[PDB]
Amino acid sequence: GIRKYKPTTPGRRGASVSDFAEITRSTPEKSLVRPLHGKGGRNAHGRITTRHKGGGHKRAYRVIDFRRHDKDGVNAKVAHIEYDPNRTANIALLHYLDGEKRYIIAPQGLKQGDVIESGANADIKPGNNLPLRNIPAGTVIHAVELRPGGGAKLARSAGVSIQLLGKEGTYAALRMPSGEIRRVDVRCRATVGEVGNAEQSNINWGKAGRMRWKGKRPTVRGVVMNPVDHPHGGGEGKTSGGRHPVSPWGKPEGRTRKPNKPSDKLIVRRRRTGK
């Protein structure tokens, strides 16, 4: 759900927050959590790799299972849905019949007290897994594997979805969330359904602290920048920089995909903005 604050202080006017009507617990299993440390956005050398990224709040990582082929043909039960900051969407706790406990992304429309099939010949119930070769055409899927035994490395954010087109030989066609079409071996695994919590977009923050806790630092505009540290800097007054916009490091906009990539001569087409 979505809740909107009633304005009572100048800073909070227009703020909103997502109503967590889908959570059942607020305590991850002690055996499945692993620690994590504040990182700061630097690297081994210590140079600032990406500007204005830092600060925030201490977070504890929880392990997730993106393999889902070690266990096959054994049913599972949906137990609980848990809070998770590390990724945009919510997650679910699974109880396998043999007794193991495991974690997966919470698909849209799922609720407590249900049955999930993970067999290679399982049903079309949402949240199930089975190889691309065995999925009927026209269904919506997520957690796509870029290739067999590679783990779900695509379409993991909230509200994303993939649509399955026809099939050919060992190849299948997928509609990318951004309109692209890509081919992948049918031997890989995937999951039916889409990521829930589709109301992520409508969140209005309106407060500096709500960004600082997440760890976003100011941006400092270009024109105000002094000429030495910037290409637009300098000038008396304020101007457009006296030169067509260029990155702060000398290289302008335009082509950004490295040509002659092994996928360059195999993949079909590119995006089109705002059709």
Partner RNA sequence: CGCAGAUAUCAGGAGGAACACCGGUGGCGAAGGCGGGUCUCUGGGCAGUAACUGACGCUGAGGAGCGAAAGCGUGGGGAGCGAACAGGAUUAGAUACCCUGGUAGUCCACGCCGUAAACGGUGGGUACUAGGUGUGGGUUUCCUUCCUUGGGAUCCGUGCCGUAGCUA
Partner RNA sequence: UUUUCU
Interacting residues toward RNA by CB under 7 A: 2, 137-138, 163, 166, 199, 201-202
Q: How many CA atoms lie within 13 A of 32 on its CB side?
A: 15
216 forms part of the interface with Mg ion (CB under 5 A):
no
Alpha-carbon distance values, 60 to 41, 86, 106, 183, 216 (Å): 17, 8, 19, 36, 19
| DSSP code, position 132 | G
Q: By C-beta, is 75 or 161 nearer to RNA?
A: 161
The single residue among 220, 248, 267, 269 that binds Mg ion, judged by CB under 5 A, is 220
Residue 209 exposed, middle or buried by CB count within 10 Å (0-12, 13-18, 19+): exposed
7 forms part of the interface with Mg ion (CB under 5 A):
no
Q: Identify the residue whose tokens are 């806790």.
A: 213
Q: By C-beta, is 49 or 202 nearer to RNA?
A: 202
Q: By C-beta, is 34 or 275 nearer to RNA?
A: 275
Q: Which does 97 bind (CB under 5 to 8 A by kind): Mg ion, RNA, none?
A: none
**Kind plus residue range of the DSSP H or E element containing 142:** strand 140-142
Q: Which stretch binds Mg ion (CB under 5 A): 58-66, 126-134, 139-147, 163-171?
A: 58-66
221 forms part of the interface with Mg ion (CB under 5 A):
yes
Q: Are 214 and 59 in contact (CB under 8 A)?
A: no
Q: Which stretch binds Mg ion (CB under 5 A): 19-27, 45-53, 163-171, 188-196?
A: 45-53
Q: By C-beta, is 14 or 248 nearer to RNA?
A: 14
Q: Which does 166 bind (CB under 5 to 8 A by kind): RNA, Mg ion, none?
A: RNA
CA 61, CA 49: separation in Å to the nearest integer? 23
Q: By C-beta, is 43 or 178 nearer to RNA?
A: 178
| DSSP code, position 7 | P
Q: Are 125 and 119 in contact (CB under 8 A)?
A: no
Segment 23-42, which members bind Mg ion (CB under 5 A)? 34-35
Q: By C-beta, is 100 or 168 nearer to RNA?
A: 168
Ranges of H-type helices in the chain: 208-212
| DSSP code, position 15 | -
Footprint of Mg ion (CB under 5 A) = 11, 34-35, 51-52, 61, 84, 87-89, 206-207, 219-221, 224, 234-235, 237, 239-240, 244-246, 271
